[PDB]
Symmetry: D2
Subunit: 425 residues, 4 copies
């Protein structure tokens, strides 16, 4: 019943490989509030890593879950079907962008969704290679670790991950990688390592998550769509983190002016219950023969009803508009703090997928990982839970529930401001 | 709201790759009973594919879940920890066989569990290759599809799965593969394709599941343990399906007389909620550096409290003894039926992990997949839900909850008896 | 100028990885005679590892080489062509078995020939995987080491060789692998790891060379041809060692009753000059696009005229018949020796591809590698150069030139007899 | 006889995959002249693709070959050794740059040399990955095709080549890739796809050959050497084409100011006879265990004496100085032609490794492959044999023997000058 006592028990019972960002054991939570085992209250700006866009235990979501719990929790869909799985698939087919008919597969984790999107693209194109981008993050299974553009620590010490995954550059002007450089890096793969006829898919996060909250511009995404179209390559949009409304539209691709062939989703789709999925061009989804897709827990009944309710909540509570309003208030406030702290070299974000990036004395070539970690620690001491990201660990991101109250927005920005003021001296 | 209308909607919204064993939409369930959307009642001998050893919605499990729903459903353990994850790890470290210190990681699906056990073995041994057995089944991610000893349909049409996974023969006297043949096939790998110094682990199901309910003998497992010891190879016991009490002991390895270095578990561990994990020798588990293990939903709070309750139920309701008793009653009944049906060439199984195998005119080299499929269909028509398995699709398995009523044991065996009598008419 | 001083210099200038079977420096040679730097004369029963079926420096071969040396030694065929390359390709299209149009590519080494046959099959079938057999030997490049069914020492310590090469069992009744077992091991790969639709070729040595001089029966080869036909898979006959007349026919496949799609050849094709090549069904050979095949030294002019002359010598000197006569004389003498030494557990071979296998106390389960090495060393001391082979290093092979004189046959057999008698004193 | 008649026979007996740059069949050649079967005389500026630095059939080389031909042509060194192989290794150990003990392995082709250098690096570092550069060319075996930075046509239509080969950018200011971009691309691989501890070697051509005659600067090579040193990575200099004197020093690395760990050589090392090898840091070479290195024809006796004689000729005839003088005369002559032809956008090269690059309207972004091909064809009609190179096929390279006389230098430049004038007419 103390965080420290539980941390000691953790070190003796759980491998050190599972890191602990905050050495705190949560006991209960509601919307943006979390209480630890000692009764201390925190304001949650991490949202369980973008999983709680509708807040901890949204009452509508919980009541849907409680009703399903009276019916059944598991049959394994492939054995005996159930309606919540079917209804969610129909809804995702309508909401994921694309003017063609789509089909949806439900699985359980984001890594599984990416795994399956790739398998489907391979079966549909009869090709085996894939292309992913620098700083990308797609999961912790062997193949998704290969797709993830970061070896340490995700796959550190394990030897080489699966081959035949080629690396393109993610466009990022802030750090000198132009859209031209990014597209040229894909043609480079075609010419040097894997011809287009051997590439089943190009996988991309419309807004990189663990990679630093860097967004693709519609122009880049349009050139990418054209390049895939030219070569029969499937464009896979990994919206596990950017999806379920974080960017102000349900899916970030809606803001890109083009539709991907396959979209993966998870995290906030079910507001705190284990569910993930893949929605894409119906004929591409159907390339795999019966028995080729599935999973024991896939599309768990309770999680399906939670997701159907999350989508209803977005509509009833106009959370997309709130995401945009929230993002503006956050950026306005961070820009204000940036006026007094040159270390804040960039304030950015689509909708509520907001981040700031820190540099030693403002030099874009010197990521300040130290100040970043210090701000995360100081915030925690003030009762605010934050996460950093980026290949250089100098990006601070905000993933607070879209259901946050106005007073809490001011409260969080004030704490952050205090952390930077106090970090000096 | 008829099964037919829902199947039509399925064809429009969900990929055909997700097979539908039974064209039925379940509406609600309780213990061993499932009711479809039309109100028809069925006896569930599939148990959601060995996930419901405590039955659908065990009341104790559901009450614990309902209580946790008033606290929190998700924080992402590696961000903010919580006690149910910790407690379950402590208990698994004690319950998994091996008289030495252990640690446990929780993830969400069985495939993720196997993925992590291999990543851990690789980090621990500083080697990259793995060996798996003929007919094995380990999951649907790219790497676990490579480990899985069956291409069609699991990875059919997708091109070749990850390399550096080698194939040994699973011992099966019924089909002419002796234990010597099995051990020799491992040495063959060492000599022809991958030396011991490049093999991080040998992955094996103590009792193959999708592969036909073929169990390893203690003598064979002991020879394997010695072979791994000699070469510094990690022995990974995949107990995703054999575990959580199906064979009469919590883990089948308990009946082998030797302990693995790592064990995967999932399915019945949480009685119908998404949870999986890996428990192993502490020093092996600790080989991965911080940040190297994780997952967004991993050890979901609700699923953890469900697992803790499943473990108490096993103890309180004497479910291990019941598994053994149930298995004896099932085999006795199946043997009686076999006296009248030569096609049943084998009746086998540890605990309640029971199966019968069909051969044309009891000819061991002639797998009778048509009869097997006919029995499954005749059983559904009589209200009994069964699954077949085996590389040749001729094994009928029984995975009915261990909480089955005495009358239902009689009912299922009687229905199976009628199916064989009516198929022979 | 002494063998010992040259061996000391060798230890300082050349990697220990290049083994040295005999610590002798050859100075000159003629037909089956070799003289070292110390003037000692030896009888060559190794033939430079089956490279000298026409003997060291056959006078007709040397005369052709001398005539070509006056013209040119290299232009790179793909840059400026030359007639000897063209003429040899025309002849091999006719000589290689297969009653259909063929085309031929010339390269330089046997490993390059195998590499090319695989590249060609992959382009022809649009598939990436290959199957090779236990104990096979196909060369020392990364891919041919993967095809090679022996890790130690060929690829020992280098980490895992290229993936997507699967292992079947070579038929060998002497060691309990029946033809049914061999064919079943192929279906096992199709079911467990790589479907036929992903297998471009099955690569096989009609008579395994480094593997122990084990020969496929015509019945087995016919079943393999039927299996390949059914699945659109290319049958590649690696005749680098079995070819150029060693078995009594120019190519061993001629005795199998069926034709492969692709044949590799090297070693004795040019009687001691660097040349290798691939001959196959015309439509298969033409699947690779222009520029996809080549090599700097490929089809070297001097080696081409040497090969053209070697083929003429085979016709003029009736070497195919001599091979069969030599083989019988050798086997007869070896059988005579086996009557006094039970350790000789088998005497076998097609044509002049002769071997005996040694067992500790006639026990086929106890390969006698120590005695084998002892016989090689004793023979060397008596002036006879021999080589062993076999995955267990207990096979003595004879690859003496087909041009050997009758008295030398007796001389060699007598030496081997003395070696076994004295090893046993 | 006729070139066209021979081309027709070629189309019927040889696969189209073997391209034919010049549809001409050579009959005889001497120094820089070649005569076809129609008796027409050509000036050879291709040198059999840089194999004839000492010219066709240098008399001293031929005399050495003739002397060896009276002794023996093949024993397979690893069976029975011979002095020429030993003597050549001793000399290469001292002449390849590196102020430390080296050992040398001889094989037969350049692709085999690169294959072995990587196998040796892998065994020495106990790592399996490699890094190669954009536009690189290393051979036609599966693994060297993966190293080769060009898919079409070298590995076109065959599916994906071996994985675990990562791609860095070769520095080339002319085309916008700075040295900083190049080094940053190596760090990118380390961070995104393969940690340094999994990279056995970085393979680089000091001057890219098929990639366009682009040379590394000493500054870049020094940074690359420092990066390899920091991470324990072996630096492999592929000097198969740049070596044996082409650049003015025996090996190009000598001009870089640093030594590689391993160097591959072939082509001009033996003046037109099949030989290749790897010379490197002794303890790295010795990391492979006995039996782990070899090859049937490896270090062929005749090619060894040819190479020993080529090295003496370089000394006796001052060929390195001549290569520098030749290079200057060529560049001066080409610059004069460039004053009248804007299409020639760059004239470059170290020593006699000279090239010019053609651009449409002198625009660096508009490679002129059509004009380049027209020049090669016109030059041939005028009796001058040329080759092009470069990933965009717009680089004309000159590889004429270093033994060329002044009159022929003038004559070849005049022919080239005419081709450009007549191309614009
Ligand atoms: C774009 C994207 N795809 C895929 C995934 C993978 O989803 P899941 O964690 O549900 O497997 C994630 C998960 N972020 O998780 C972080 C961590 O574990 O350090 C993600 O952001
Ligand atoms: C031993 C074993 N390991 C691992 C797994 C994989 O576990 P999970 O389904 O939770 O990923 C399974 C799952 N069986 O799944 C059947 C199917 O989808 O056809 C399994 O039996
Ligand atoms: C059937 C076969 N294929 C292919 C090859 C490879 O041919 P090459 O050595 O010309 O590359 C060989 C070579 N045997 O060489 C033995 C050794 O080096 O220990 C062979 O026997
Ligand atoms: C740097 C380098 N390494 C390695 C090699 C390979 O050497 P080899 O051709 O002797 O195998 C080459 C050969 N270039 O040959 C051209 C072609 O066949 O199109 C090369 O240039």
């Amino acid at each position: 019943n103390s965080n420290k006592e539980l941390m000691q028990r953790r070190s003796q019972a759980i491998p050190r490989g599972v890191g602990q960002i905050h050495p705190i054991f949560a006991d209960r939570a509601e919307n943006c509030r979390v209480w630890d085992v000692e009764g201390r209250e925190y304001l949650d700006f991490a949202g369980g890593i973008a999983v709680l866009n509708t807040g901890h235990l949204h009452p509508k979501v919980v009541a849907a879950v409680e009703a399903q719990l009276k019916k059944l929790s598991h049959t394994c869909f492939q054995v005996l079907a159930y309606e919540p799985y079917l209804e969610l698939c129909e809804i995702m087919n309508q909401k994921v962008p694309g003017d063609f008919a789509k089909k949806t597969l439900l699985v359980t984790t984001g890594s599984e969704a990416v795994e399956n999107a790739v398998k489907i693209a391979r079966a549909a194109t009869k090709r085996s290679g894939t292309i992913a981008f620098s700083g990308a993050y797609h999961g912790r299974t062997h193949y998704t670790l290969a797709l993830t553009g970061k070896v340490n620590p995700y796959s550190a010490g394990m030897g080489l991950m699966p081959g035949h995954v080629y690396r393109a550059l993610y466009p990022c002007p802030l750090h000198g990688i132009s859209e031209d450089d990014a597209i040229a890096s894909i043609h480079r793969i075609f010419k040097n390592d894997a011809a287009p006829e051997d590439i089943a898919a190009i996988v991309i996060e419309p807004v990189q998550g663990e990679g630093g909250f860097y967004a693709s511009s519609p122009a880049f995404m349009q050139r990418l769509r054209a390049l895939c179209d030219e070569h029969g390559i499937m464009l896979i949009a990994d919206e596990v983190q950017s999806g379920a409304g974080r960017t102000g539209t349900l899916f970030a691709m809606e803001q890109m002016g083009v539709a991907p062939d396959l979209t993966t989703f998870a995290k906030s789709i079910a507001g705190g219950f284990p569910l993930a999925g893949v929605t894409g061009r119906a004929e591409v989804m159907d390339a795999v023969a019966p028995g080729g897709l599935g999973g024991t827990y896939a599309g768990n009944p309770i999680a399906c009803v939670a997701a159907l309710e999350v989508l209803k909540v977005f509509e009833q509570e106009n959370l997309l508009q709130k995401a945009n309003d929230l993002g503006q208030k956050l950026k306005d406030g961070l820009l204000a703090i940036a006026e007094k702290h040159p270390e804040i070299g960039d304030v950015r974000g689509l909708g509520a997928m907001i981040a700031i990036e820190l540099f030693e004395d403002g030099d874009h070539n010197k990521p300040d990982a130290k100040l970043t970690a210090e701000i995360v620690a100081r915030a925690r001491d003030k009762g605010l839970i934050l996460l950093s990201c980026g290949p250089y660990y100098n990006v601070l991101r905000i993933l607070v529930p879209l259901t946050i109250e106005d007073a809490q927005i001011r409260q969080g920005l004030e704490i952050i401001s205090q952390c930077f003021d106090e970090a000096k001296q």
